[PDB]
Design a protein around this ligand. Structure first.
Ligand code: GTP
Ligand code: ACP
Ligand code: FB7
Ligand code: GDP
Ligand code: CA
Ligand code: CA
Ligand code: CA
Ligand code: MG
Ligand code: MG
Ligand code: MG
Lengths: 436, 54, 326, 422
């Protein structure tokens, strides 16, 4: 067994981490006090769930997680919330004042003063590991901390844990879901500094999550809790293979092996189905054919783009619930004759399939209905470059007038870092255009 | 259409289907960047205090 | 209030559309790069489809289908017809065609090789770039991506004049992927007797005798139907339009899964110009599909108004000249 | 994360007093500093503006400054006058004679250290000081001259903290002396350099609203100040109440100020009766020029950034539909090169006596009109060196007037520069 440390950075990283660990405990039969009656080995073990949870002699199951934020009000909710008893205090790290939506302030000014404490707390987690695989890193693109501190942390993790895999779950900014004016700057600055240190990164567009919450859950004005419980179902689908007995995506390395033929193009598109309203007075359960077809609906993608106008480099289907391989193949055959699925010609036209028999777990009193089967598709398609072009265009609009740049220079950043990061994104856009 | 690498266990199973075949910066360096930005912040503050002293 | 932007200053059709939109008092034109629009009249090339449908609270409609170029480029249209099972290599209404570069199909073309062919490209404009020849060597020496297409040696000739023509049909596909065929088409005729300028019917290429038989070498349906009755004892609908409707519907149904916007975050409509040849057996052949067509001067008013009614006000309601093909 | 509030001179202390009456009522604090509210939302962020003294008393983190006793004896006798910390009243006896030089260079300079003593005492019992807010006028002597001297000395002692002002711009329609354009031109130069956000309150705009809209035949300063404390309560709502927002002063400045010198905001309020106001009426009115508190027409400029704060219980779907409708009807008046530069914020706690309200904060290039009109009034007198002896008698030279005029004209030019940017 090989351990995984999760790192949540900034408000969005922390609140999503809350939602994920709430869900994990429900999936594994772990109560909020950390106890786990099914675990008949007290004080330790090397089961699959031990990749995410350590154990104390009192039988408490403790997330291998650190929460980091530059101000204390979000993590203070963790310290006093339902799951307060779950986390060691050393794992919840807060500063005095935040990065004010300024990458430069999170990276240079405040980052410099807190990074060694964060690394010291992570090292304590790593010293509990018999064989650490690497890190899962959760943050917003748009926040000062999420962008600026995460990129500093990623650089230092590469130094201190050179061999170890790093995966990101990144929240891509959408004005539907309260954004700062400067989030295009922060997104581009953090992508450029983080690109070479991330092996595989899952972007979640707040616009897509927002729309699914409106259209499928009939929530007129989604809250962060609504957004985060939906996001945590997708994260759980992606990480289920590390926490349960399985044979696909068993370690962090396998995500790169299966999804990323070229290091820079390491942003797989996630599509999830079905999302069903819990207050649905009457519902009808969808079949394997139907949820697999739904994975090629842009309305169900985590990033709004059009895969029919890109090319695929890799594709994984992750099913939870009542699914057998025979159904998956019949559904794939039907879809391939009806959908625009074009692979790049230097790659096999195939699907790696994983099935976990336990149907998705849902938070009691939540917005999501229990379904007999669900699937998350991870596909590396050039179509996701649409989101980069959108973001790069907004950056270009503001940067041509140098709007807001003085805030970043004022924190010790040089204007040259702006254009350097922007030319890296242009190269990245050209890379997608070459392969697609 | 071919099914390969079928693995089964009590929790589920995994397999691959194929439709068609095909046709870092050091610690010192980061520290220097951080110190360079700090120095520029220190320069700008000193210019401010010098302006205010005048 | 509805808002739109103009990004193709050379479109005669949407110049008249935007003029109509403004003259309704309920549409306002924004600068080219204001993203807060309802309607984009996009540019012919490099239209940034990826930036549409992300402005919160705005219904966004554009006047091009992303992916429709596959039908509207010559080389790619040949590939589409050949490799689409619904159109098939057996397709009876499209001349034998091969894609030739200066994958390539030079060998299979030679195998097939009345042996007159025509070579063209979509880079060919204003008449030049085209070569009709009976020896394959002269055609390939002229090319050195082009298409080599069987030249229809037996075209239907209008009398008097013994003269070749082509038929342009205008087709509007709305956001619901309804297919609307403008009831008025145009014939673009040669002013020169056909001799096996009198082989290329393009309006610019047309030569003395230009305008002799009809204003600007353009014959409309009322007269052409009336000629078909007098000379051939048949009708335009029976002998030609049934085939035209079938071809239009086949082409557009074929790519519908690849380009439809019915479940997308933005919506598309598009005006297409289809070009047909008629042979002497009254068989209709597709020659080209044009993704950015102009219109006949007399028909500019009616058709531009119909675009606003069917494609624009259907999505943006205010306060039939088309045949629906289904 | 604490804010230290400072109020200076007659206008600054009278508007300041009303501000603390209003927000004390919103937070459930009685005139004796006892909390008698009904909701925990009232206390959750009470520490932003109030210190807790034993007996669960809440004392405003407010410093009251004047160069003469009168207005601060009025505050002390006022409704909530007992709430303020007695040590936090810092006053001289001489006055400043509506003279910026006396506030800035002579009478004010004798008093400023002891004010900075109270500021230091407040700042040093802060867990993590956000920054400072100052209320003053720009047309008199103490708030104008001594107030900007305070800002300069605060910036030197706390160079990394945010500084905000609610600044009242003079107008001949509502004028005490003819030297107001001199006093205001000298102050605007200070504000350009040493504040992060300045909320521009034009007494001309305030008067016209009381006369034309509120139908007040004879507005008093009290009527003007009622509009101002209401707007002050609105713009600080996102600091004082638990929202999904999570914004400190620095975050507000980062999102609202794209170029360091262009940090002068037009505020606005709606409504300006027991009748239920619908969301469309609220949104239409808060963007109406007639609801603006800087006498500038937004249709004469372009918006760089806008914040719109709605208070009360209402449909947010409706809020968004009307916001997006207002933008389409004003498409021409937002700059295209700052994407998504209109922020909508909601707070479920309505102000006293209103079911719903809306506060507008606009960084518009139309604000140049305010500075242009002050520059014109300045130059009409300065061309003849009229009334200058009051200032040269305090040791100022004419060159310092020429520089301040020059600096303001530069500010006007920069606004026109970005108004024409495409
Ligand atoms: N889905 C989701 N998005 C969030 C959440 N919280 C913030 N965001 C988004 O994250 C971006 C803002 O970044 P934050 O994570 O809040 O900022 P931060 O990392 O704490 O940085 P600072 O507060 O500037 O120090 C915006 O685009 C928000 O829409 C959340 O809980 N869920
Ligand atoms: N296979 C064929 N047989 C006979 N004539 C043909 C032909 N292909 C093309 N032509 C003639 O050549 C003319 C121009 O051909 P084509 O349509 O390829 O050029 P083009 O794209 O410039 C006209 P458009 O304005 O419709 O785009 C046609 O009007 C037709 O008369
Ligand atoms: N007085 C105020 C009040 C607000 C607000 F928060 F909106 F109420 C704002 C404000 C404006 C804006 N804008 C202004 C226009 O451009 C969009 C962002 N953003 C924010 N955010 C962004 C990130 O989350 C924290 C608060 C706050 C500024 N000044
Ligand atoms: N809105 C408002 N303006 C005031 C008030 N008192 C004075 N003013 C204005 O402020 C200017 C006079 O400055 P003032 O504050 O009285 O002088 P100071 O005590 O030396 O700062 C003039 O422009 C007056 O119109 C007030 O209570 N409310
Ligand atoms: Ca165990
Ligand atoms: Ca590495
Ligand atoms: Ca004295
Ligand atoms: Mg934060
Ligand atoms: Mg053509
Ligand atoms: Mg006075």
């Amino acid at each position: 067994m090989r351990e995984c440390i999760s790192i949540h950075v900034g408000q969005a990283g922390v609140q999503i981490g809350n939602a994920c660990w709430e869900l994990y405990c429900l999936e594994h039969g772990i109560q909020p006090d950390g106890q786990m009656p099914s675990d008949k080995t007290i004080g330790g073990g090397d089961d699959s769930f031990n990749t995410f949870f350590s154990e104390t002699g009192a039988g408490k199951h403790v997330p291998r997680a650190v929460f980091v934020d530059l101000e204390p009000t979000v993590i203070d909710e963790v310290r006093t919330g339902t799951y307060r008893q779950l986390f060691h205090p050393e794992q919840l790290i807060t500063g005095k004042e935040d990065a004010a939506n300024n990458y430069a302030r999170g990276h240079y000014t405040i980052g410099k003063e807190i990074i060694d404490l964060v690394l010291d707390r992570i090292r304590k987690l790593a010293d509990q590991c018999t064989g650490l695989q690497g890190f899962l890193v959760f943050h917003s693109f748009g926040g000062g901390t999420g962008s600026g501190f995460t990129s500093l942390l990623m650089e230092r993790l590469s130094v201190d844990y050179g061999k170890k895999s790093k995966l990101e779950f990144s929240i891509y900014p959408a004005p539907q879901v309260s954004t700062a004016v400067v989030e295009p700057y922060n997104s581009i600055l953090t992508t450029h500094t983080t690109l070479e240190h991330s092996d595989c990164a899952f972007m979640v567009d707040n616009e897509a999550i927002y729309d699914i919450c409106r259209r499928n859950l009939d929530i007129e004005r989604p809250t962060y809790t609504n957004l985060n419980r939906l996001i945590s179902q997708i994260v759980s689908s992606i990480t289920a293979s590390l926490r349960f007995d399985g044979a696909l995506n068993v370690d962090l390395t396998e995500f790169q092996t299966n999804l990323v033929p070229y290091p820079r193009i390491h942003f797989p598109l996630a599509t999830y189905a079905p999302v069903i309203s819990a207050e649905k007075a009457y519902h009808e359960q969808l079949s394997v054919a139907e949820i697999t077809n739904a994975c090629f609906e842009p309305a169900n993608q985590m990033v709004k783009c059009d895969p029919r106008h890109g090319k695929y480099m890799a594709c994984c289907l992750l099913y939870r619930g009542d699914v057998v391989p025979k159904d998956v193949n019949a559904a794939i055959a039907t879809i391939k004759t009806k959908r625009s699925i074009q692979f790049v010609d230097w790659c096999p036209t195939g699907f790696k399939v994983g099935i976990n028999y336990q149907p998705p777990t849902v938070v009691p009193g939540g917005d999501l209905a229990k379904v007999q089967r669900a699937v998350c598709m991870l596909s590396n398609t050039t179509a996701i470059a649409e989101a980069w072009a959108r973001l790069d265009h907004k950056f270009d609009l503001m940067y041509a007038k140098r709007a807001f740049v003085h805030w970043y220079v004022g924190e010790g950043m040089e204007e040259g870092e702006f254009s350097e990061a922007r030319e890296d994104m242009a190269a990245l856009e050209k890379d997608y255009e070459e392969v697609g | 259409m071919e099914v390969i690498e079928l693995n089964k266990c009590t929790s589920g199973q995994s397999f691959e289907v194929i439709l068609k075949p095909p046709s870092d910066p050091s610690l010192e360096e980061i520290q220097k960047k951080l110190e360079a930005a700090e120095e520029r912040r220190k320069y700008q503050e000193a210019e401010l205090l010098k302006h205010l002293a005048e | 209030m509805y808002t739109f932007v103009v990004r193709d200053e050379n479109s005669s059709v949407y110049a008249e559309v935007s003029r109509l939109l403004l003259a309704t008092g309920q549409w306002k034109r924004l600068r080219k790069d204001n993203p807060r629009f309802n309607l984009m009249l996009g540019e012919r090339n490099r239209l940034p489809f990826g930036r549409l449908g992300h402005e919160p609270g705005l219904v966004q409609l554009v006047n091009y289908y992303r992916g429709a170029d596959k039908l509207c480029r010559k080389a790619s249209l040949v590939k589409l017809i050949k490799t689409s099972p619904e159109l098939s290599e057996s397709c009876t209404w499209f001349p034998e065609s091969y894609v030739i570069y200066p994958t390539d199909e030079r060998e299979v073309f030679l195998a097939a090789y009345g042996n007159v062919w025509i070579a063209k490209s979509s880079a060919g404009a204003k008449g030049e770039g085209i070569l009709i020849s009976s020896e394959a060597s002269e055609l390939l020496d002229f090319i050195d991506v082009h298409v080599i297409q069987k030249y229809l040696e037996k075209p239907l000739l209008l009398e008097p004049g013994h003269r070749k023509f082509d038929i342009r049909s205008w087709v509007l596909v709305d956001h619901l992927y309804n297919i609307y065929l403008y009831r008025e088409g145009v014939l673009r005729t040669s002013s020169e007797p056909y001799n096996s300028t009198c082989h290329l019917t393009n309006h610019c290429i047309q030569s003395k005798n230009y305008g002799r038989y009809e204003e600007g070498n353009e014959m409309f349906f009322e007269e052409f139907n009336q000629y078909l009755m007098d000379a051939l004892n048949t009708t335009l609908e029976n002998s030609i339009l049934l085939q035209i409707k079938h071809i239009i519907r086949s082409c557009l149904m074929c790519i519908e899964p690849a380009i439809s916007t019915k479940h997308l975050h933005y919506q598309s409509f598009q005006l297409f110009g289809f070009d047909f040849m008629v042979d002497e057996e009254l068989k209709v052949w597709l020659i080209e599909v044009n993704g950015a067509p102009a219109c006949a001067q007399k028909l500019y008013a009616e058709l531009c108004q119909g675009i606003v009614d069917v494609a624009i006000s259907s999505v943006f309601p205010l306060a039939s000249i088309f045949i629906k093909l289904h | 994360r604490e804010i230290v509030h400072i109020q200076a001179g007659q206008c600054g202390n009278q508007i300041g007093a009303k501000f603390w009456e209003v927000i004390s009522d919103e937070h459930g604090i009685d005139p004796t500093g006892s909390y008698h509210g009904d909701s925990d939302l009232q206390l959750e962020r009470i520490n932003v503006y109030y210190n807790e003294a034993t007996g669960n008393k809440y004392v405003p983190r407010a410093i009251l400054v004047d160069l003469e006793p009168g207005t601060m004896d009025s505050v002390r006798s006022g409704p909530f006058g007992q709430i303020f910390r007695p040590d936090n009243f810092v006053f001289g006896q001489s006055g400043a004679g509506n003279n910026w030089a006396k506030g800035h260079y002579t009478e004010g300079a004798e008093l400023v250290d002891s004010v900075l003593d109270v500021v230091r005492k407040e700042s040093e019992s802060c867990d993590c000081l956000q920054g400072f807010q100052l209320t003053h006028s720009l047309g008199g002597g103490t708030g104008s001259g001594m107030g900007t001297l305070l800002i300069s000395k605060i910036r030197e002692e706390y160079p990394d903290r945010i500084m905000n002002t609610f600044s009242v711009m003079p107008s001949p329609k509502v004028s005490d002396t003819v030297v107001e354009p001199y006093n205001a031109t000298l102050s605007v130069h200070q504000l350009v350099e040493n504040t992060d956000e300045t909320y521009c309150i034009d007494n001309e705009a305030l008067y016209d609203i009381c006369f034309r809209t509120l139908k007040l035949t004879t507005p008093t300063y009290g009527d003007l100040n009622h509009l101002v404390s209401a707007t002050m309560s609105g713009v600080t709502t996102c600091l004082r109440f638990p929202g999904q927002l999570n914004a400190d002063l620095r975050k507000l400045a980062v999102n609202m100020v794209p170029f360091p010198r262009l940090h002068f905001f037009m505020p606005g309020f709606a409504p300006l009766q027991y009748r239920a106001l619908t969301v469309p009426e609220l949104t239409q009115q808060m963007f109406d020029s007639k609801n603006m508190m800087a006498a500038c027409d937004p249709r004469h400029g372009r918006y760089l950034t806008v914040a719109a704060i709605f208070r009360g219980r209402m449909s947010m779907k409706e809020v968004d539909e009307q916001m997006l409708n207002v933008q389409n009807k004003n498409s021409s008046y937002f700059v295209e090169w700052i994407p998504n530069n209109v922020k909508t914020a909601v707070c479920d706690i309505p102000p006293r006596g209103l079911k719903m309200s809306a506060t507008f904060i606009g960084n518009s290039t139309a604000i140049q009109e305010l500075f242009k009109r002050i520059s014109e009034q300045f130059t009409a007198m300065f061309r003849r060196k009229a009334f200058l002896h009051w200032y040269t008698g305090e040791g100022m030279d004419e060159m310092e007037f020429t520089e301040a005029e020059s600096n303001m004209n530069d500010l006007v030019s920069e606004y026109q520069q970005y108004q024409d940017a495409t």
